[PDB]
Design a protein around this nucleic acid. Structure first.
Ligand SMILES: [Mg+2]
Lengths: 292, 145, 251, 131, 242
RNA sequence: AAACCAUAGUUAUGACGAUUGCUCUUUCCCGUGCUGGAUCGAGUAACCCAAUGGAGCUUACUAUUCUUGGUCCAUGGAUU
RNA sequence: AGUCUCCCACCAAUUCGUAUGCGGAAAACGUAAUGAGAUUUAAAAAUAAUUGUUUAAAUCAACUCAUUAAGGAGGAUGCCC
């Protein structure tokens, strides 16, 4: 099980209209990721917090998983999730996360300042905390804050796909990643690939080699990509789909119809699941004795 | 869990590269002809830039990126040619090898960089520097006779 | 206020080694405090009555559970010895030949039709299950179900940490805080099932047969079913870790 | 009473996502060496270029390179980083590490190149253990 | 204490007469080595295997440390020793070691071909094995010969000076020293500084860091360098005396 | 103007190499078995780090990211 | 590690002159026998410190509070005898 949670979408503001070449390149990179081997892919949509958010719901998600990705998934064989990263610098008054969190699945953040970082670590209900590996770090990251945030939830994300962009960016990328690994105590680390084209994608072994050269062990990398990725997906799926982790609208009978796994069955415009009657009172309780 | 630093003490020694002039063979004479002085065109940003260029040229891209995160010159004065560079405990050997591989300054030629003392604290570095400076005066006083 | 500050700076340059630190780390207090540091009768009656009824009902439930647990074992052993497989045979046999031991055994045949329909009607009217299914609200229905009462409900264990607890259906008689009480039936099984909630997944299906044959696929999670509000709302929730749910994704 | 790691095998394969360009342009054995040297020089300095490695069983976008156990990390980190630009084809090339082996036991085909390599390294393994 | 065993003498042949400028430069570089901190110095003299050896014993060594460096010895307080390397290519123009082993103290070799390595590992009363680190190695350093020549007592010499000459030969020197480290398996490794100018000599820390980053552990560097240099000096002195 | 004092002492406790012991799995042997022996391997962890000394309490740790002992009107299978 | 407590000068006594279940110089300290309790309670929640979850609420287990002063002698009961 391999999860990639940082596939960028060729759009930053809602004023942009995505051409067919970009979605075709995304189709090609999804096919590339499926060729070598992958299990879960969640595309990212970066937007800024300062500008006004449109006062709509059915126009906030320009992904259309059902029309094009739903048309290609039956041939591909995997699932796609929508993710949004809130790049916050100053505490402005524009804040309507109650709609974006419910419309999207996973909500992440990209702070630039220290006050924004503190408020996103304490009060903002998010899932992943991403740092600008292209730019420098805001200030000296402390240990206690990151550890209490990991124990409270949100983990840090390392984007090894950015180091393939430029020549001078690799130094700052390494200087940020080493500091993040040192300050996070190597507990809440999730790795992603921020590649916009299939030309900058790698295999799982290349990722393992790069991360073990950076300083994190290989077994911990595999553990974080196997279970910590599934858990951070489950968190963002259950906090939105279900209530505050008390009642889930998904019923797993076997091992394939799970709230994060079963995506074509569970309705999304509502939260119902129309299934034929399979549980009455006249059937024998013991499953080993119950035979049809 | 704790940021471990390690300072390196280095010295600039000028060898008497002159075959037309015969030299006196003793301790303090060669100590004085090797510790003559540093040229005027000597600074901290001029030595840091030179060592960064040398490190990027010898090690490479990642080899310079991993060491240039905490590579700073804390204390250095051109009067005696003794400097203290800060670095990490993981890349200390790489910084020592870069100091060894220092070829020449952009304008000044014929010089050697010698690493003397390396430790993870500045107090012991200062103590060793004071001890070395006190030891230097002994041979001088003995040879002045 | 420049001169006295300069004078105390000259005062600190004698004792301390860096005189300008206490002002920057704010260690020189400008002020220091000098102060020693500094119709009731029926209510009582009904409260006592309620406390007594609770204390009696707890012991009564415990003794009922113990009696059922012993009677199941005794009757199962007697049936195995008696050369009897069918339930309709064992029931009548112990009726004619064991009068007392029959008054303690339960009768699931009457436990089904009263409980199931009285719960289904209540849940149908609560969730507003209408002939049409275009008047629904998912989040509000989830809030209602979290606030809903599950006494007399049918639940099935679909996933669990133990590979043997899964697949058990039963109607509950009481909702405890650590264990879950149900009743299951088989060919000779009439076991009162006490199942742990730490690490199990349940599910309940509501039948809908207006014209077609449909059913809602809902489910609950025991691990976080202990810190929910009961019968009302307005309780401060805390994010726990959302990490001990690995068994959900594993299998 | 232990074993000394001589080197480690690395199953490399140039993977470019353009068949229209792959079937047209050809790739030979000198291209692989040139790409390796360029990658080493672009990612590292002389430290990366001084890596000992040879070529065994060169095929169409398939190659087997033996790298010492001491610099396996240095090799595998530079392999996954560099991307060829304007070396021999207008389309950039990148390499994907299929698998790694440290005991010569690996499974591709029913050919005998592995077999004669194993012959040589057998008469050399017994020789190195005896001497 | 530190030991240097690879100080070259500015003279290749026997017809080659020394120049006062060369002697002055050698004095300068030895003073610089003593300035950086050293105790034992062993100057080396190169000769070709094709050249005719003299029919002398009183003239085999054109050094005579007692008359030239004997004043520096008791003034600055160091020692000097005699060492000669053999540039051997093919089995011809040779078959004489009993007379060259009595005059000098350390005998080295420089094989550059296929049969040169075999003849160096077969019947040569040598102590150190030196390769041309500047240019390419002859064929390939294998374990079958290196293990056999190290198990008897012959060590491999590494010249960290050849690296500081130019920029292009650095790649070849690195590719050769790493091959030697991989083949020798890091047991019999002795290091020397083959610099003739006082601008290409370094200290113990830099050399240790270089050899550590090049593939040798920190225990091997120190132990091998120190104890093996002392032991080769000791056995050379013993075979010279008796 | 000092009282300057730690079988670590002021944020130093570094670099590797070798040996024994422990957990499970792979096989062999005598006599089922043995704190049995011998290879083929992996692991030796996580929580976290002193700044004057001692005691009590609470809170973090040990899932292929080392272990050990006991209990369970917890369930699962079998005999009486 | 932790915003917890206390010792690190004495005081035949305005100085907790405190023979108070046991040990202890003190401890917002360890443990033992019995009874009861759950925003309807002595007090924990859904109008000093610490902890991601942060006692219980079928039975057990865990927390809190309310009683039992040290030593010697006589009688009764139960066990080996
Ligand atoms: Mg502390």
């Amino acid at each position: 099980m391999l999860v990639d949670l940082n596939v960028p979408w060729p759009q930053n503001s809602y004023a942009d209209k995505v051409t067919s070449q970009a979605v075709n390149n995304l189709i090609k990179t999804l096919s590339t990721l499926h060729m070598l081997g992958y299990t879960h892919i969640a595309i990212n949509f970066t937007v800024n917090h300062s500008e006004k958010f449109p006062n709509d719901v059915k126009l906030l998600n320009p992904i259309d998983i059902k029309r094009r990705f739903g048309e290609l998934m039956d041939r591909t064989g995997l699932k796609l999730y929508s993710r949004i990263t809130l790049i916050i610098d100053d505490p402005s008054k524009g804040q309507s996360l109650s709609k974006i969190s419910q419309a999207f699945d996973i909500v992440a953040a990209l702070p630039i300042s220290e006050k924004g970082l503190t408020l996103s670590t304490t009060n903002l209900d998010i899932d992943l905390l991403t740092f600008q590996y292209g730019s420098r770090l805001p200030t000296f990251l402390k240990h206690k804050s990151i550890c209490s945030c990991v124990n409270r939830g949100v983990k840090l994300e390392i984007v090894y796909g950015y180091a393939l962009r430029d020549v001078q960016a690799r130094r700052q990328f390494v200087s940020n990643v080493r500091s993040v690994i040192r300050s996070s105590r190597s507990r809440g680390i999730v790795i992603g690939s921020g590649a916009m084209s299939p030309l900058e994608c790698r295999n799982i072994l290349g990722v393992t080699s790069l991360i073990k050269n950076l300083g994190l062990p290989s077994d911990r990398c595999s553990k974080a990509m196997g279970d910590l990725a599934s858990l951070v997906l489950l968190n963002g799926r259950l906090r939105n789909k279900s209530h505050k982790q008390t009642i889930v609208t998904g019923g797993g009978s076997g091992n394939g119809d799970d709230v994060v796994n079963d995506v074509q069955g569970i309705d999304d415009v509502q939260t119902i699941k129309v299934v034929k009657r399979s549980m009455d009172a006249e059937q024998l309780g013991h499953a080993s004795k119950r035979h049809k | 869990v704790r940021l471990k630093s390690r300072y390196i003490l280095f010295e600039i020694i000028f060898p008497p590269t002159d075959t037309n002039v015969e030299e006196s063979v003793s301790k303090a004479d060669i100590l004085l002809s090797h510790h003559r002085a540093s040229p005027a065109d000597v600074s901290i940003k001029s030595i840091l830039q030179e060592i960064r260029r040398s490190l990027s040229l010898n090690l490479g891209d990642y080899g310079s990126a991993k060491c240039n995160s905490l590579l700073q010159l804390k204390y250095f004065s051109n009067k005696t040619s003794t400097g203290i560079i800060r670095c990490h405990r993981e890349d200390c050997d790489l910084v020592i090898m870069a100091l060894m591989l220092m070829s020449k300054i952009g304008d000044v030629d014929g010089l050697i960089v010698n690493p003397v003392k390396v430790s993870g604290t500045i107090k012991k570095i200062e103590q060793f520097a004071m001890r070395r400076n006190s030891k230097i005066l002994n041979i001088i006083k003995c040879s002045q006779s | 206020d420049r001169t006295q500050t300069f004078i105390k700076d000259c005062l600190f340059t004698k004792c301390l080694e860096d005189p300008e630190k206490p002002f920057n780390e704010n260690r020189f207090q400008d002020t220091l405090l000098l102060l020693p540091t500094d119709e009731s009768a029926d209510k009582q009656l009904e409260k006592r009555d309620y406390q007594r009824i609770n204390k009696n009902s707890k012991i009564a439930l415990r003794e009922y559970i113990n009696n059922c647990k012993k009677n199941t074992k005794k009757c199962l052993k007697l049936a195995y010895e008696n050369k009897i497989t069918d339930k309709e045979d064992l029931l009548h046999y112990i009726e004619e030949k064991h009068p007392t031991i029959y008054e303690s055994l339960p009768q699931y045949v009457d436990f089904v039709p009263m409980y199931k329909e009285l719960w289904i009607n209540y849940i149908k009217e609560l969730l507003n299950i209408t002939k049409n299914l275009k008047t629904f609200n998912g989040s509000l229905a989830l809030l209602k179900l979290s606030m809903a009462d599950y006494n007399g409900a049918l639940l099935r264990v679909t996933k669990s940490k133990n590979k043997t607890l899964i697949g058990l259906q039963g109607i509950v008689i009481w909702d405890s805080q650590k264990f879950f009480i149900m009743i299951v039936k088989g060919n000779i099984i009439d076991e009162i099932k006490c199942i742990p909630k730490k690490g199990t997944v349940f599910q309940f299906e509501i039948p809908i047969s207006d014209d077609d044959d449909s059913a809602l696929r809902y489910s609950i999670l025991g691990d976080r079913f202990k810190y929910r509000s009961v019968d009302r709302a307005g309780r401060k929730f805390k994010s726990r870790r959302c990490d001990d749910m690995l068994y959900y994704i594993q299998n | 009473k232990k074993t000394f790691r001589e080197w480690q095998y690395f199953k490399l394969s140039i993977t470019s996502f353009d068949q229209d360009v792959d079937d047209a342009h050809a790739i030979d054995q000198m291209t692989w060496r040139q790409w390796l040297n360029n990658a080493l020089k672009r990612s590292y300095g002389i430290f990366g270029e001084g890596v000992e490695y040879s070529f065994l069983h060169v095929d169409d976008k398939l190659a087997y390179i033996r790298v010492n156990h001491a610099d396996k990390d240095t090799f595998s980190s530079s392999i996954s980083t560099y991307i060829s630009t304007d070396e021999l084809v207008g389309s950039p090339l990148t390499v994907s590490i299929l698998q790694e082996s440290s005991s010569l036991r690996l499974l591709e085909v029913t050919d005998d190149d592995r077999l004669w390599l194993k012959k040589v390294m057998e008469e050399e393994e017994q020789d190195c253990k005896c001497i």
